[PDB]
Design an enzyme around this catalytic site. Structure first.
Site, PDB file in Angstrom:
ATOM      1  N   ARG A  78      -6.594  42.069   9.869  1.00 50.17           N
ATOM      2  CA  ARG A  78      -5.966  40.767   9.827  1.00 50.17           C
ATOM      3  C   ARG A  78      -4.561  40.961  10.371  1.00 50.17           C
ATOM      4  O   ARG A  78      -4.001  42.050  10.271  1.00 50.17           O
ATOM      5  CB  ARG A  78      -5.900  40.261   8.381  1.00 50.17           C
ATOM      6  CG  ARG A  78      -7.254  40.154   7.677  1.00 50.17           C
ATOM      7  CD  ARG A  78      -8.049  38.981   8.190  1.00 50.17           C
ATOM      8  NE  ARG A  78      -7.465  37.713   7.756  1.00 50.17           N
ATOM      9  CZ  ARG A  78      -8.115  36.556   7.726  1.00 50.17           C
ATOM     10  NH1 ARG A  78      -9.396  36.499   8.092  1.00 50.17           N
ATOM     11  NH2 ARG A  78      -7.485  35.459   7.317  1.00 50.17           N
ATOM     12  N   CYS A 107      -6.159  29.455  11.950  1.00 48.01           N
ATOM     13  CA  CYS A 107      -5.834  29.625  13.364  1.00 48.01           C
ATOM     14  C   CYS A 107      -6.284  28.404  14.178  1.00 48.01           C
ATOM     15  O   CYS A 107      -7.415  27.927  14.033  1.00 48.01           O
ATOM     16  CB  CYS A 107      -6.501  30.889  13.910  1.00 48.01           C
ATOM     17  SG  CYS A 107      -6.544  31.005  15.724  1.00 48.01           S
ATOM     18  N   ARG A 121     -11.795  45.130   7.498  1.00 45.73           N
ATOM     19  CA  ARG A 121     -11.184  43.807   7.590  1.00 45.73           C
ATOM     20  C   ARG A 121      -9.772  43.894   8.148  1.00 45.73           C
ATOM     21  O   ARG A 121      -8.805  44.135   7.414  1.00 45.73           O
ATOM     22  CB  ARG A 121     -11.190  43.109   6.221  1.00 45.73           C
ATOM     23  CG  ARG A 121     -10.807  41.615   6.263  1.00 45.73           C
ATOM     24  CD  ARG A 121     -10.822  40.993   4.855  1.00 45.73           C
ATOM     25  NE  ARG A 121     -10.757  39.525   4.887  1.00 45.73           N
ATOM     26  CZ  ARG A 121     -11.812  38.723   5.019  1.00 45.73           C
ATOM     27  NH1 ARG A 121     -13.036  39.231   5.125  1.00 45.73           N
ATOM     28  NH2 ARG A 121     -11.648  37.405   5.044  1.00 45.73           N
TER      29      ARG A 121
END
Lengths: 321, 321
Positions: free
Chosen positions: B159, B81, B157
């Site tokens: 994403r 990113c 997690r």
């Protein structure tokens, strides 16, 4: 590490509690003192200590009865900072282990080290408990925050140093060493590029913000950042001093910070960490790079302890009629 | 990693950009697709990629000519990113390399993955730029944040997964996989104690606020803390799910967080990290423990990619008269 030819501590015995890498031992031995006992909790620290000194320090100091501690003249401890809930108010903490040994063995000197903010911890009474405990045990209490960069070591690293003398000795002339001009910089401590290639981090989000400087200066000099420019994400000049080594810091350049070295941005090598903590090149560092960072980031600055140890010896040895 | 016998991607070619450990490669190959090109920047990632797949991915994608990239049907990229300052705004970023490759090669599908906050990054602008770019390249854009814990993997997690279909295909029916009950927990993925004692951390400032739980649960369960209870200073139950793995996290239990395992507090082993990222036991981890942590901390969750890859195939294959 510096060389001391005038061995002010010759013929004195010390113990090294919370020994870690054995920084206090290096310092006091350089002044001629003899280590008669060492204790270190961490197995990987015991390991490297053994590699360097031949013996393994005893483990968990809480299992060790104070009566079994050998007679000694100086007690050293770079001990973990903990909040207390004087002497009885220190119970439950690792500091109490120091207090119980001091009470039993009554060394001439208690020499302790801790983090720079120690004076501020628990709104000031962690320090007050330590000070009052030492007073109640019949010791004076001298404390001062000293910065490594003022004592020949190119690192931004303030720590509190606490020196206590048993009152019956009537020591009135102890002085912290006076600061002096820094003549060694990070650049002077680097390994060749080949030995550190693995520590190089090439990143596209690198932004260099300042040009390399032309004159060495006794401060941290930031040249660039990576990512968001926070912890472990800043790049410094080797012509300045090192940023504070951290045992547990995170980020891309975790533990050491990043340095601009010959067109590349990299962490410091464990040997470079040793050097910026004042450890001699004869000192064998832990095989694990990550464990070495943790150990040095948690260690003491040898040179500062040496100047203080020399001054402790100076004070003990001034005994006019 | 899950077993797929219905190989929906049989006969399709894919490329694996910013390959890392090759997580995309595992997922797509499990669905029957063939890898025809991979690229990975990091030297140590290339090493372990080669150990597992027999070939070393090409380096620096910015210096690769897009025209030289092999023909493919699916372009995969789990890319870093980066803030932008449409297509033109991407320039100066690694995403620009994805775009210029897409522009020349025109794959049927672009399959990307990034951090959970990618949606809110730069206040939506980052994702806007990606979406508008894909739209300008004549792709539809589908994105959704999925949590590993909802797809059979015991790790907290989230994403973002982005899937783009070339407009001429007129894909109307792509769906993200539906979440399902978690029946695997950290305890199920642990190594025997003999393999992991080097990861044990014995400390004194450990404060346990809850007892070990008796029920399994699809949540992170904090049982205690060390130090100040911040990053990498928290202890979790293995009867819950793993806290999010981090490549650059710090703290005493850096990268993996701490776990209460058979009376001891320890980090996860890199094999356990592989498992909580959905990597098969046949996947060889990096010989360097610290390097393996960084790799898994920045990797993709295999199972989630498998479910998505299967659904990409499901959509590509639905072609009624």
């Amino acid at each position: 590490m510096i060389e001391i030819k005038d061995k002010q501590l010759t013929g004195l015995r010390f113990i090294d509690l919370f020994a870690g890498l054995g920084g206090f031992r290096l310092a006091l031995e350089s002044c001629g003192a003899e280590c008669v006992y060492s204790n270190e909790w961490d197995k990987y620290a015991q390991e490297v200590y053994e590699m360097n000194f031949g013996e393994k320090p005893e483990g968990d100091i809480t299992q060790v009865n104070e009566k079994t501690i050998p007679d000694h003249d100086i007690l050293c401890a770079g001990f973990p900072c903990q909040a207390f809930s004087g002497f009885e108010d220190s119970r439950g903490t690792l500091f109490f282990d120091i207090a119980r040994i001091v009470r039993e063995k009554k060394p001439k000197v208690v020499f302790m080290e801790n983090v720079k903010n120690f004076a501020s911890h628990d709104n000031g009474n962690t320090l007050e408990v330590v000070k009052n405990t030492m007073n109640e045990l019949d010791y004076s209490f001298h404390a001062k925050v000293l910065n490594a960069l003022d004592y020949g070591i190119p690192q931004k690293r303030e720590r509190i140093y606490m020196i206590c003398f048993r009152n019956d000795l009537n020591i009135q002339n102890f002085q912290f060493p006076k600061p002096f001009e820094l003549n060694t910089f990070v650049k002077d401590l680097l390994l060749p590029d080949s030995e550190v290639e693995h520590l190089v981090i090439d990143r596209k989000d690198l932004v260099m913000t300042n040009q390399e400087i032309e004159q060495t200066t006794p401060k941290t000099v930031r040249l660039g950042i990576v990512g968001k420019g926070g912890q472990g994400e800043r790049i410094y000049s080797t012509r300045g001093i090192a940023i504070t080594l951290s045992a547990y810091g995170g980020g891309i350049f975790a533990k050491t910070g990043g340095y601009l070295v010959n067109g590349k941005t990299r962490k410091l090598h464990p040997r470079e960490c040793a050097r910026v903590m004042g450890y001699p090149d004869s000192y064998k560092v832990h095989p694990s790079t990550s464990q070495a960072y943790k150990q040095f980031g948690n260690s003491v600055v040898i040179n500062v302890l040496q100047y203080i140890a020399y001054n402790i010896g100076s004070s003990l040895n001034f005994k006019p009629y």
